[PDB]
Design a protein around this ligand. Sequence first.
Ligand SMILES: [Mg+2]
Ligand SMILES: [Mg+2]
Ligand SMILES: [Mg+2]
Ligand SMILES: [Mg+2]
Ligand SMILES: [Mg+2]
Ligand SMILES: [Mg+2]
Ligand SMILES: [Mg+2]
Ligand SMILES: [Mg+2]
Ligand SMILES: [Mg+2]
Ligand SMILES: [Mg+2]
Ligand SMILES: [Mg+2]
Ligand SMILES: [Mg+2]
Ligand SMILES: [Mg+2]
Ligand SMILES: [Mg+2]
Ligand SMILES: [Mg+2]
Ligand SMILES: [Mg+2]
Ligand SMILES: [Mg+2]
Ligand SMILES: [Mg+2]
Ligand SMILES: [Mg+2]
Ligand SMILES: [Mg+2]
Ligand SMILES: [Mg+2]
Ligand SMILES: [Mg+2]
Lengths: 271, 104, 88, 66, 129, 70
Amino acid sequence: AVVKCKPTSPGRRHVVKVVNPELHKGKPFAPLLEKNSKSGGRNNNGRITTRHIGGGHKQAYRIVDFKRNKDGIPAVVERLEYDPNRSANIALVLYKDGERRYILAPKGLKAGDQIQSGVDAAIKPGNTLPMRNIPVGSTVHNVEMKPGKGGQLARSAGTYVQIVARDGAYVTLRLRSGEMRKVEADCRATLGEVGNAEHMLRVLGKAGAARWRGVRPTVRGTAMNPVDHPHGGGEGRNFGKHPVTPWGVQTKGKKTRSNKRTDKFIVRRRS
Amino acid sequence: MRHYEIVFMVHPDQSEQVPGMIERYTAAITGAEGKIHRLEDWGRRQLAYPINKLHKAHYVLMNVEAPQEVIDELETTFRFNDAVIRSMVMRTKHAVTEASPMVK
Amino acid sequence: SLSTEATAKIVSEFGRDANDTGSTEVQVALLTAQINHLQGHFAEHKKDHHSRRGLLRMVSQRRKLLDYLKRKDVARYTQLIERLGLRR
Amino acid sequence: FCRFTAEGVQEIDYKDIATLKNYITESGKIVPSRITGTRAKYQRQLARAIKRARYLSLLPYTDRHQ
Amino acid sequence: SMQDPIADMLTRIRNGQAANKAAVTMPSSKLKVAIANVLKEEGFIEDFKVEGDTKPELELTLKYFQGKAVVESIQRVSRPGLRIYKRKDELPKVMAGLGIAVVSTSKGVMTDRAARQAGLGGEIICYVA
Amino acid sequence: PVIKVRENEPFDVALRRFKRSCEKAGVLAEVRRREFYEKPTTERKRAKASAVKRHAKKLARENARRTRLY
RNA sequence: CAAGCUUGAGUCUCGUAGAGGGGGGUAGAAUUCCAGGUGUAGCGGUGAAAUGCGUAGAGAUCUGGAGGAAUACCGGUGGCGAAGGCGGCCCCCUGGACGAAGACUGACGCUCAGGUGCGAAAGCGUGGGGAGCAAACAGGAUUAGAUACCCUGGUAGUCCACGCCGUAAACGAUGUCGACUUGGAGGUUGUGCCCUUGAGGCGUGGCUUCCGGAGCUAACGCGUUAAGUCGACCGCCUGGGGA
Ligand SMILES: [Mg+2]
Ligand SMILES: [Mg+2]
Ligand SMILES: [Mg+2]
Ligand SMILES: [Mg+2]
Ligand SMILES: [Mg+2]
Ligand SMILES: [Mg+2]
Ligand SMILES: [Mg+2]
Ligand SMILES: [Mg+2]
Ligand SMILES: [Mg+2]
Ligand SMILES: [Mg+2]
Ligand SMILES: [Mg+2]
Ligand SMILES: [Mg+2]
Ligand SMILES: [Mg+2]
Ligand SMILES: [Mg+2]
Ligand SMILES: [Mg+2]
Ligand SMILES: [Mg+2]
Ligand SMILES: [Mg+2]
Ligand SMILES: [Mg+2]
Ligand SMILES: [Mg+2]
Ligand SMILES: [Mg+2]
Ligand SMILES: [Mg+2]
Ligand SMILES: [Mg+2]
């Protein structure tokens, strides 16, 4: 549920919290945790390869099961948990055989709910089955692109995909971007939309919240000197040039997809 | 326990698969202590208009007294089952055991 | 609406002499039960205004009945409100 | 005059296709109660039945559609 | 809701007189009955008759002279919304003594003249002309 | 309005039949009605007028037109 | 104040008709767009034109797909709802009304300043959605001018979710409840009897349309659903502007 903060201080004035009382008030399941050290947007060459990253709160990596492989054996959801790594929420599930795994939490999923992966798996939210077994028209999330690879599409907070068509060995997917994409019919996908839908409604409220999320301040190109950015320089506020990246590439409109390998899967580009 | 009236059309290619389906449906109804008052396989029948590109369909009628949960389950089964094209579960006041005009 | 069997049961519970059905107390109980039933409905269906109107009317009627009981015989009223667990 | 009153039917059946066919025109449209002489109570029932039939492909929505 | 029975009765009477009805019937009351009796005494109605045990019905036989109604005008004075009480000297005269004013007095319901004779006032029920 | 020309049938007669069928359908009229969006108010108003019109005409016929005109 | 009574008011039994409300599904027709086929020079539009779309192949025509919105016919001075309003079909949850007999409760009622809720359309906020329609805007006409009417386009908006807004010729321009008073022609929804000897006959209730009598009204008209005859309670008006 969305909660607007009382303006007791400036910088608290605009803050909107997403408060979910269904989340686990306690420690994550340690066997599925692992160390996740920060980059600061720097590669193996130690150069900043992506600006505006650094700082933020220390985050343990939750080992989310995107692959979803436990076929036939039904799980029960123990608890929904906060995951710092993703916009979505995750759920600690417990298989009848004894294994515990984290999965992406779907929309209507709660504690005590039963889920199943497999071919025989019944069509209900949270359940995972090959897309040739899933009826056409359904909302689906955590979609595999290559059979067995692991969910790759519609992972984020409230996202989902529609199975618009099934034609032979390919199912056509209406991606969240609006892109129509052919994917193999034998690819695994988890029924329903991913859970934390109201995530977008939250507002950070102050610069500090951005920092906490590991985001360093973005400097306007036009603020810089000509040496620093193609937008740089000018007495007062000048900007006679067409908008470009820091590396002089048109930023308003200039299409940059070059991947000729995957072009055959793309039925229609997003609009 | 509410009196319903279920009528479902099956794909003409799946016509030999129909009796088993019927049996299964009956079984489920029986499970929740539900009565089955009249059951009429109308057979293969020519449609007034083509539905999803076909011109013939296999018609089945089934009047049943049951709870609503099982009816809901049946509806769900129908929706997910590709062999059954159309399905019309309809609430009825009485048992209506008497034969239909088209069978008559 | 309230099922026949339930109504009968209510009558049996609150009826001073057999299945009298008309008693003020009985009526109040019937209304109360209906209100309770409808609460669940209204939790689900927030925008069902026409139905809500009916509920409100029922509530009003119940209140009126309670008031009538109060002026008539206080002890009985008290007993009823112990039974049903209403604040006033 | 009304045919349903003389017969005294409890409810008009959507499965009774032939009877329904008498109350729809060449283009598949429902014939008005003024033309048929049907009572208003039964007329609505008949209409409902026709609609049901249309849904269940027993009667057509229109003469054209193929 | 019905708030004035006497007024209703009077209205009924008026309507009967208008519509040339021989008899007018209504649910009976004691005060009503008294009023009817008074009217009979004064000669504005032919007869009054109470009939029934559980819920009795007063039946008034209306009076007509030369094809036209005897009761020309009939108006309530005291009413539930506005009660009217007069003293013996304050007692009104309907049609300059020709018409009557039905008054509920300490010593029963009577005409205004009778009340005056007695030497007592009370609630003026209605004027009859 | 599907019309099928039968054996040993003239063209003109067939045309006439087709026309009749069209009339029965009320297809042209329907098209005319749907040519522009009529406001619901306007639709109601027209209906009311029609209702008035019919009744008034009937009244004129039955009651007013049973007397010596000449 | 005390005891009662059953006619007001309410409860119960069985049915009845209904676009009453909320939620979830689905169907068919059509518009639009997308892909492809056939095919060739116009299409579109109007009072007449032009802008516009078209030999980069339109319009037309067939196939397949996508999506949104609205539900032809039935459909009715028909129905339901307090009003606003509500219209494909199906299911789930649900409010009201009426009749039929009885049985019960026993005045528990009416009205209502403040207060609370509901409240068309447009609008506003966040998030969706977006076919058609279309404020704004653009171009073409028309014209003395045309910030219009007409045409080609077309964005908010219209649709959904949750909030806000609280107004309309929100009208029957007629506050709510009760009683009484000549009639006729209907419609609709029950129900009792009668040989249903037939679609009928004789009744008796509920809701409703038109005509009209007495009466009322300035007149127009209203006229058992009153604007008649009365009672109860509330809201409101005090010359026209300014306002
Ligand atoms: Mg950045
Ligand atoms: Mg920034
Ligand atoms: Mg900046
Ligand atoms: Mg500088
Ligand atoms: Mg430098
Ligand atoms: Mg440079
Ligand atoms: Mg400068
Ligand atoms: Mg410059
Ligand atoms: Mg109901
Ligand atoms: Mg007020
Ligand atoms: Mg709006
Ligand atoms: Mg908006
Ligand atoms: Mg946004
Ligand atoms: Mg928006
Ligand atoms: Mg658009
Ligand atoms: Mg325009
Ligand atoms: Mg347009
Ligand atoms: Mg106003
Ligand atoms: Mg209106
Ligand atoms: Mg007004
Ligand atoms: Mg009131
Ligand atoms: Mg009149």
